[PDB]
Design a protein around this motif. Sequence first.
Motif, PDB file in Angstrom:
ATOM      1  N   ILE A   1      53.576  23.346  -3.400  1.00 25.03           N
ATOM      2  CA  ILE A   1      52.884  24.167  -4.670  1.00 25.03           C
ATOM      3  C   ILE A   1      51.332  23.701  -4.625  1.00 25.03           C
ATOM      4  N   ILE A   2      51.043  22.395  -4.729  1.00 22.81           N
ATOM      5  CA  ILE A   2      49.717  22.144  -4.728  1.00 22.81           C
ATOM      6  C   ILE A   2      48.947  22.763  -3.598  1.00 22.81           C
ATOM      7  N   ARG A   3      49.467  22.571  -2.374  1.00 25.07           N
ATOM      8  CA  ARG A   3      48.901  23.160  -1.100  1.00 25.07           C
ATOM      9  C   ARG A   3      48.515  24.507  -1.268  1.00 25.07           C
ATOM     10  N   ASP A   4      49.421  25.346  -1.806  1.00 21.19           N
ATOM     11  CA  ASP A   4      49.255  26.927  -1.876  1.00 21.19           C
ATOM     12  C   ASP A   4      48.342  27.074  -2.954  1.00 21.19           C
ATOM     13  N   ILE A   5      48.133  26.206  -4.053  1.00 20.49           N
ATOM     14  CA  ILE A   5      47.348  26.548  -4.983  1.00 20.49           C
ATOM     15  C   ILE A   5      45.863  26.225  -4.497  1.00 20.49           C
ATOM     16  N   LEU A   6      45.577  25.054  -3.796  1.00 20.99           N
ATOM     17  CA  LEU A   6      44.413  24.723  -3.340  1.00 20.99           C
ATOM     18  C   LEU A   6      43.687  26.012  -2.293  1.00 20.99           C
ATOM     19  N   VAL A   7      44.542  26.317  -1.624  1.00 21.65           N
ATOM     20  CA  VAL A   7      43.948  27.880  -0.714  1.00 21.65           C
ATOM     21  C   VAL A   7      43.761  28.965  -1.784  1.00 21.65           C
ATOM     22  N   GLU A   8      44.610  28.981  -2.773  1.00 19.72           N
ATOM     23  CA  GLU A   8      44.276  30.228  -3.790  1.00 19.72           C
ATOM     24  C   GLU A   8      42.843  29.884  -4.394  1.00 19.72           C
ATOM     25  N   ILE A   9      42.699  28.807  -4.713  1.00 15.24           N
ATOM     26  CA  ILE A   9      41.264  28.282  -5.550  1.00 15.24           C
ATOM     27  C   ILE A   9      40.161  28.649  -4.617  1.00 15.24           C
ATOM     28  N   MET A  10      40.302  28.252  -3.334  1.00 14.43           N
ATOM     29  CA  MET A  10      39.072  28.424  -2.392  1.00 14.43           C
ATOM     30  C   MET A  10      38.797  29.844  -2.142  1.00 14.43           C
ATOM     31  N   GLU A  11      39.957  30.697  -2.399  1.00 16.47           N
ATOM     32  CA  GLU A  11      39.869  32.308  -1.847  1.00 16.47           C
ATOM     33  C   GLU A  11      39.333  32.785  -2.920  1.00 16.47           C
ATOM     34  N   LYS A  12      39.833  32.418  -4.305  1.00 17.43           N
ATOM     35  CA  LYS A  12      39.570  33.315  -5.639  1.00 17.43           C
ATOM     36  C   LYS A  12      38.588  32.827  -6.527  1.00 17.43           C
ATOM     37  N   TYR A  13      38.799  31.349  -6.720  1.00 20.67           N
ATOM     38  CA  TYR A  13      37.984  30.662  -7.997  1.00 20.67           C
ATOM     39  C   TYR A  13      36.868  29.593  -7.454  1.00 20.67           C
ATOM     40  N   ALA A  14      36.600  29.796  -6.295  1.00 19.70           N
ATOM     41  CA  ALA A  14      35.860  28.535  -5.868  1.00 19.70           C
ATOM     42  C   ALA A  14      34.689  28.124  -6.514  1.00 19.70           C
ATOM     43  N   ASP A  15      33.929  29.102  -6.821  1.00 13.94           N
ATOM     44  CA  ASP A  15      32.721  28.770  -7.867  1.00 13.94           C
ATOM     45  C   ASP A  15      33.042  28.286  -9.166  1.00 13.94           C
ATOM     46  N   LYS A  16      33.991  28.526  -9.850  1.00 12.50           N
ATOM     47  CA  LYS A  16      34.453  27.977 -11.030  1.00 12.50           C
ATOM     48  C   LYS A  16      34.917  26.568 -10.777  1.00 12.50           C
ATOM     49  N   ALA A  17      36.019  26.504  -9.864  1.00 14.36           N
ATOM     50  CA  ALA A  17      36.349  25.282  -9.811  1.00 14.36           C
ATOM     51  C   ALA A  17      35.280  24.161  -9.363  1.00 14.36           C
ATOM     52  N   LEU A  18      34.330  24.601  -8.647  1.00 15.17           N
ATOM     53  CA  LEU A  18      33.359  23.681  -7.956  1.00 15.17           C
ATOM     54  C   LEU A  18      31.963  23.472  -8.923  1.00 15.17           C
ATOM     55  N   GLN A  19      32.052  24.224  -9.966  1.00 20.16           N
ATOM     56  CA  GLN A  19      30.756  24.080 -10.801  1.00 20.16           C
ATOM     57  C   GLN A  19      31.039  23.121 -11.914  1.00 20.16           C
ATOM     58  N   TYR A  20      29.932  22.489 -12.680  1.00 25.04           N
ATOM     59  CA  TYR A  20      30.196  21.863 -14.072  1.00 25.04           C
ATOM     60  C   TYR A  20      30.842  22.913 -14.885  1.00 25.04           C
ATOM     61  N   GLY A  21      31.830  22.377 -15.687  1.00 20.26           N
ATOM     62  CA  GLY A  21      32.548  22.990 -16.789  1.00 20.26           C
ATOM     63  C   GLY A  21      31.980  22.748 -18.281  1.00 20.26           C
ATOM     64  N   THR A  22      32.451  23.553 -19.354  1.00 22.11           N
ATOM     65  CA  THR A  22      32.152  23.001 -20.612  1.00 22.11           C
ATOM     66  C   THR A  22      32.818  21.809 -20.966  1.00 22.11           C
ATOM     67  N   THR A  23      32.452  20.996 -21.830  1.00 23.58           N
ATOM     68  CA  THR A  23      32.879  19.849 -22.551  1.00 23.58           C
ATOM     69  C   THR A  23      34.181  20.124 -23.077  1.00 23.58           C
TER      70      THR A  23
ATOM     71  N   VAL B   1      36.534  19.927 -13.161  1.00 21.52           N
ATOM     72  CA  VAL B   1      36.853  21.382 -13.284  1.00 21.52           C
ATOM     73  C   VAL B   1      37.799  21.644 -12.140  1.00 21.52           C
ATOM     74  N   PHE B   2      37.615  21.185 -10.928  1.00 21.72           N
ATOM     75  CA  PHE B   2      38.395  21.435  -9.873  1.00 21.72           C
ATOM     76  C   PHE B   2      40.011  21.192 -10.266  1.00 21.72           C
ATOM     77  N   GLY B   3      40.140  19.919 -10.750  1.00 23.61           N
ATOM     78  CA  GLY B   3      41.592  19.764 -11.229  1.00 23.61           C
ATOM     79  C   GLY B   3      42.088  20.506 -12.215  1.00 23.61           C
ATOM     80  N   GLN B   4      40.992  21.012 -13.268  1.00 21.75           N
ATOM     81  CA  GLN B   4      41.653  21.941 -14.352  1.00 21.75           C
ATOM     82  C   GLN B   4      42.015  23.206 -13.850  1.00 21.75           C
ATOM     83  N   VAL B   5      41.241  23.687 -12.629  1.00 17.32           N
ATOM     84  CA  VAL B   5      41.818  25.180 -12.355  1.00 17.32           C
ATOM     85  C   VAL B   5      43.034  25.085 -11.203  1.00 17.32           C
ATOM     86  N   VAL B   6      43.449  23.574 -10.636  1.00 20.33           N
ATOM     87  CA  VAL B   6      44.484  23.545  -9.990  1.00 20.33           C
ATOM     88  C   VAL B   6      45.408  23.558 -11.269  1.00 20.33           C
TER      89      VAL B   6
END
Lengths: 404, 404
Positions: free
Chosen positions: B51-73, B279-284
């Motif tokens: 499931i983690i593997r599928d989620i990582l693929v999904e994030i790079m396809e669809k959510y990469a900029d949110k997962a890779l940027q700074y987040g709010t506190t 943020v990357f772990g929070q998107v996962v």
Amino acid sequence: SMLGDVERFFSKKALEMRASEVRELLKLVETSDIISLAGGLPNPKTFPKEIIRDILVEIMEKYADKALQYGTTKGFTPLRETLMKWLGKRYGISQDNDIMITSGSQQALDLIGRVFLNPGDIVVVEAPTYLAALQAFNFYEPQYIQIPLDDEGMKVEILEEKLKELKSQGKKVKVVYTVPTFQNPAGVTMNEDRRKYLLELASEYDFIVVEDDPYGELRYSGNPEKKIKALDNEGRVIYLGTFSKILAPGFRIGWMVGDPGIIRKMEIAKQSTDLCTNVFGQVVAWRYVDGGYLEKHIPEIRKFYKPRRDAMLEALEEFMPEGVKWTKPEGGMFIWVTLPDGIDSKKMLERAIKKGVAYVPGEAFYAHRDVKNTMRLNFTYVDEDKIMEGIKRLAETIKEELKA
Amino acid sequence: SMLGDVERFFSKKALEMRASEVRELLKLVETSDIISLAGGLPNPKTFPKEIIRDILVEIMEKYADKALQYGTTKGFTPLRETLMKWLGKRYGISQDNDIMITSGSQQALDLIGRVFLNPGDIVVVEAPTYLAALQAFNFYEPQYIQIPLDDEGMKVEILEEKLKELKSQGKKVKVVYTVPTFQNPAGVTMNEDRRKYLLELASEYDFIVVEDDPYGELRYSGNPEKKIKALDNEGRVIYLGTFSKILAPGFRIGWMVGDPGIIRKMEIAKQSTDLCTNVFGQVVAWRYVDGGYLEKHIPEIRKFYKPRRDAMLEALEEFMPEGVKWTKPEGGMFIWVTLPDGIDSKKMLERAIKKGVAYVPGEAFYAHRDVKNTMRLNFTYVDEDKIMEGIKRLAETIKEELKA
Ligand SMILES: *Cc1c(COP(=O)(O)O)cnc(C)c1O
Ligand SMILES: *Cc1c(COP(=O)(O)O)cnc(C)c1O
Ligand SMILES: O=C(O)CCC(=O)C(=O)O
Ligand SMILES: O=C(O)CCC(=O)C(=O)O
């Protein structure tokens, strides 16, 4: 609150915590159509997404149990080893230092405060300095001495003056905190002679130097400086690096390099604050550095930001009225503007927002909040074309502000 | 250290920080072939790696900029929203609470100390309690009141006695910290009457309750308890959850749910300690919960650990001499053993290691280090077959210790 005077539960320090009025306004500005020059973010177009994707696959195939489990407080050993190899080859940082992984350099600054600062201990900062470092340290109640910068970074001569004057009061500085290359917010770089002069003072007056270096690889012109840490024969410098601008900030991984006595204390302090930095991001960063991708990607980040810096520097020269001055960074993410005739840039921001442009008022970056005519501008994360238009709008704002 | 006496730079709190020497010994024990029952780690066989593997693929396809940027506190909004939906549906926690994402519940515990505790403020803990919570709070110099546990969790009766005695001294408690379900280390669970009784005290004596709940989903037998936070009509409970044992600890993501006035202060305090949780772990974590995967995976964790708990409970019954007692957890990762005849289990550990088994001496789990005949055993991460063999070695160690 349901409690309802919830304040009756708060600690003395919590009672003095407040959210920034300016930062709240600027959160708003970001979600609108105003051209914001106020950001402090790197541009996601610089995140090495394809290399990250390949690394994520590699981790699930080969390193999943290590990436997924708790880690040691000190950090993932292969990342610590690959960073010290990198730092030694690239910068000539000495291998007799130790290294701890941090949850960003923000966590390094908080830990420096915990480990070194008693209430009233004196910390020297540049004027201006990185506002989040003041935030980190403020929890520990230091007294600050501010040392102005010029176009060659911290005026170390005035630091010697201030150290002599403190010594005549029977007092000493404990820590000098410096962002000596492509400063946030000033954009300037401490020259080599000053780096060496700072270190002679560090020896003569017996203080610790914290060198925070997020940007040294985002160099667009000129030649690499020597890290203060690479000149540090006495082990008085704690060097902070981070992946935030050279990989992406989303993994929240940084590192702290220094005397093994100091690192050992930092590790014990960290254990109770977060147990360990997220190991999954540490395994990603380890593959990124050890696999050679950091080295290959750095030139792509420089190619992306350089023309953005140059567009902003071009626009300021063409549009700004006489008496406005700005720094000329060789790297990093910021340009720092000084306004003439006593304009207060905090007061001016209302006028700028009304004209469609935002910036961060400089006051927040001074420990003593005592300079009012300065602004921080960012070129990394505006839409390019909007850099020219944003600088025009700001130039016109300043023109109108100058009219009584 | 290069600096000679580096201690001359350290703060007063740093000068009191020490590495645990028990913890140092056990680090070494883990890398050998002694059978260790001392761990506090979940078993990587429970991590949902597909499931983690599928989620990582999904994030790079669809959510990469949110997962890779700074987040709010405060945290990644979709994760905050999905957690509050989850906690309301699963547990009946009320939606008028607010939520902040943390870098592990360890970071929540440090921030509770920062926000609530002045030096000398009184914190109530169970006896025993979670060692890392004592570590987190110790930086802020509280006084502790210890309340013993029985097989139904904290003896809330004794807490009322101690609250009346303190009131007679003109004092009050600020915070009660409880790990009320499948305690680490004791393995026992506070019954429903006592949860309600604690909240009546929290109202009558005006204190805050922190409910740390990492294990409630790791239930192997019995029926689900009501969360203290689900009974909390006054908004006096701060509820801490974490992904460490239900997803994997490598992402270092947790959450803190409570009164919006308290959460707002916690957000300001956190901003200076780490800017944001990765943020990357929070998107996962968000895909994991919002995609239904957590709900599907929990039964797989239960199926894995249950037979290990049962093997350990069988082995203790078969092997332990008379007068040894142990808890009977319905869930979680630990069994807690009480030794007869005044045996000191810290002293006995040397004997146990010589016989090929290790455990954590109970003394470290008491704020006042005043009980010496207890031990924490873990059944999650011994290779099973070694559970029976480990318990036998420990039973023989105890028999030898009982002789002269
Ligand atoms: C960008 C920045 C950092 C980054 O901090 P992290 O917590 O590693 O993201 C630190 N220091 C300064 C001066 C910065 O501008
Ligand atoms: C497992 C455990 C935790 C986990 O803390 P994290 O920092 O989220 O990994 C917290 N509290 C207790 C009592 C635990 O046993
Ligand atoms: O937006 C963020 O979280 C980064 C803020 C920042 O870079 C800072 O204030 O140190
Ligand atoms: O090994 C780890 O980092 C986990 C330790 C732990 O869970 C604790 O001490 O609270």
